[PDB]
Amino acid sequence: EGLEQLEAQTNFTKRELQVLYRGFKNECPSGVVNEDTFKQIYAQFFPHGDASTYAHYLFNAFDTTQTGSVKFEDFVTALSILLRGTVHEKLRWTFNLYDINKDGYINKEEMMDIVKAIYDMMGKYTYPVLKEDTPRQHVDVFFQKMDKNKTLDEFLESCQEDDNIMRSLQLFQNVM
Amino acid sequence: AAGVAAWLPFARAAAIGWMPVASGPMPAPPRQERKRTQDALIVLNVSGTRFQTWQDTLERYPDTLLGSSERDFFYHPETQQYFFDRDPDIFRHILNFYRTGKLHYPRHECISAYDEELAFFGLIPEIIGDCCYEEYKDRRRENAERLQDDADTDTAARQRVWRAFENPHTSTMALVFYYVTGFFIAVSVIANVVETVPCGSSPGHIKERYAVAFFCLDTACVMIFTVEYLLRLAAAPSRYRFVRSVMSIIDVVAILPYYIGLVMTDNEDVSGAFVTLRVFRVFRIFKFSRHSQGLRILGYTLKSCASELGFLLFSLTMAIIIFATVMFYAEKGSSASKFTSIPAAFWYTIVTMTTLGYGDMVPKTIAGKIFGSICSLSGVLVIALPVPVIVSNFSRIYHQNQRADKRRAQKKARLARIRAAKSGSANAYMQSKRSSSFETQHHHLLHCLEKTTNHEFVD
Amino acid sequence: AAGVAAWLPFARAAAIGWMPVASGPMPAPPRQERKRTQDALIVLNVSGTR
To answer: In this structure, what are the phi and psi dihedrals at residue B83, rounded to the nearest 5 degrees?
Structure first.
């Protein structure tokens, strides 16, 4: 709307809201953004590798109700609750991001694809020369950080039990 | 309509027409406002100068972006105006449309820019007036075929040589096989023609030459051709669509006569089929299709102008019938009477269609000569009717061929430019690692990714 | 490049994806003059037309 959408469905000032809307319309004149736009903006931001599946998961998180193309209201609401929201909102967003399907548990293959999406970007021009093994140690470290049994509440508690990730949450909560 | 709101109060007066008949609760006007007109000439400054319009003029089509409070997203509060960041001349046409309810497309503008301006303002391309709609549609179709050609094909195992095979100017082996099979087609047709000459396969000297060695030359060549056909059976992306392709039909038609003659002479000596075999032996000429760059162009041109050639056929048949009947009926009384039948007059009418002229068959009566002359002129005009269309299509397709080659070169240059820009961004990041405001946060996100993957980036 | 420089905040949301998978000293943002786009529109004249 923009008339009453000052704080009801967003967490930004009028100036920030209007400039974000103008920029989005400049990049999306139709007013609706699709998956390919996410692909190409994510490739333009990081011009050092392949940026396909992580952008796909990001859009799927943004694609609420599986519409296939999110409008401005939900997009700006997500940006607001992730950049100027509460901690539980960020954890909910990360939960939905890491929950590709709709089960109550997060299994091995989900972490496999997530770590592949994280590690494929640097390509073949990195000093440590990453291989398929490093995702395996990373997933093992994450899983031993997770509960031993084959939990979203446990992941939440582990997130709030370590200050390194909490100080890695206000990195952008303050700026922009 | 919603764009004639200024006449809405007049319709109020129309109530007085049926007011004596009117009888009811009359829930009264719904809390009307601003009894006197307070129409504000709201200003809309688009990347420079400004355009003023009445509020009802902009709000008579609320279904679009400029209706409702959506426009206020681009409202500029500190300046009390609407600073849109769009093109300031297409907006002029949008304003004229809003005033009229009808949009005109000026001829001298890029369609991509016009259409993206239309999309930015939340319009539909289907509201163009028929005066401009036809021109906009022509421009749509030309840029549509342009963008279609922009992304037609891209060069992308045992099947891999197939791409080499069907693009022989890729590998040395494919090119040599292509050239040598063309040479084989040529040598086979030359073998046929030098078989037909009396010095080779006639009893020129019964006393003594008649070589039956030519009976081998075809067979080997035929077998050679088979393998590449079999090759296309092996590396076939489509098992049945390939056969459905006209090329494969021509290849199998050229291949068959040798084998069908083998079977026939194995079982029968059917009269009139051996000469048919010799006749069909020549379609290696059509098998030349791949080597002839322009034969595909010719075939596509003929396919495109199918209706025109059909109309030519119909018209020429009608003219032949009319003229042959006329000349046979007005010439049957002659002494020689070579016009012995309507089919007899068919040959004369068809040799006088094309200004050909043989003198073997000419009319001998006063009406005959004049009808023959009129026949010749009518045939000339009829046969000349479709040739401009045929040659126009041929030259057109030639032009799309060359322009598609140039466009492919342009796309290669553009991908080279894109990868050069990628390399520039990469080395800029690397030198920033070694040592504008935007690049600060760009490299900040890059370093955040480096931290989250603990993998340092090298040159 | 900066061709979509109006989409930097969204990219920050992308960073939110990868904190639990992160292992680093977190050198923090490199600071800036203002964390917004308060830079007002500039009027530029080209031969008497602004």
So the answer is: -90, 90
The experimental method behind these coordinates is: cryo-EM
User: DSSP assignment of C6-48, as one string?
Assistant: GGHHHHHHHHHTTSTT--S--------S-SS---PPPP--BTT
Expressed in Å, this structure's resolution amounts to 4.5
Task: Return the beta strands (E) in B188-263 as ranges.
Answer: none
Bridge partners of B128, per DSSP, are B103
Chain A environment of C9 (Cβ under 8 Å): 20, 79, 83, 172, 176
Side-chain-side CA neighbours of B281 within 13 Å: the count stands at 27
User: Coil, strand or helix: which one is A100?
Assistant: coil
Whether B110 contacts B79, CB under 8 Å: no
**Residue B50 pairs with which residues in a beta bridge?**
B45
Check residue B15 and report its DSSP letter.
H
Structure tokens at B206: 């019964």
Residue C31 to residues A143, B57, B81, B444, Cα–Cα distance (Å): 35, 47, 34, 10
Closest CA to B165 of B155, B173, B153: B173
Task: Using DSSP, state whether B103 is helix, strand or coil.
Answer: strand
Binding-site annotation: residue ranges of B for Zn(2+): 104, 110, 131-132
DSSP code for B82: E
User: Annotated binding residues of A for Ca(2+), as ranges?
Assistant: 99, 101, 103, 105, 110, 147, 149, 154
Q: What is the DSSP letter of C50?
A: -
Give whole-number Cα distances, A82 to A30, A106, B380, in Å.
25, 22, 80
| Interfacial C residues in 12-41 facing B (CB < 8 Å) | 12, 14-15, 18-19, 21-27, 29-30, 32-33, 40-41
CB contact under 8 A, A127 and B453: no
Q: Which residue of A has its CA nearest to B124?
A: A30
User: Helix axis angle, B366-384 relative to B306-331, nearest 10°?
Assistant: 180
Residue B396 and residue B301: Cα distance in Å, rounded?
9
Question: Which has the closest alpha carbon to A87: A145, A147, A165?
Answer: A165
Is A26 near chain B, with CB under 8 Å? yes
Helix, strand, coil fractions of chain A, as percent rounded to 5: 60, 0, 40
Q: Do residues B233 and B165 make contact, with C-beta atoms less than 8 angstroms apart? A: no
| Cα(B87)–Cα(B454) distance, integer angstroms | 46
Residue A174 C-beta-side C-alpha neighbours within 13 Å: 11
User: Structural domains in chain B?
Assistant: 5-151 (3.30.710.10), 160-294 (1.20.120.350), 295-419 (1.10.287.70)
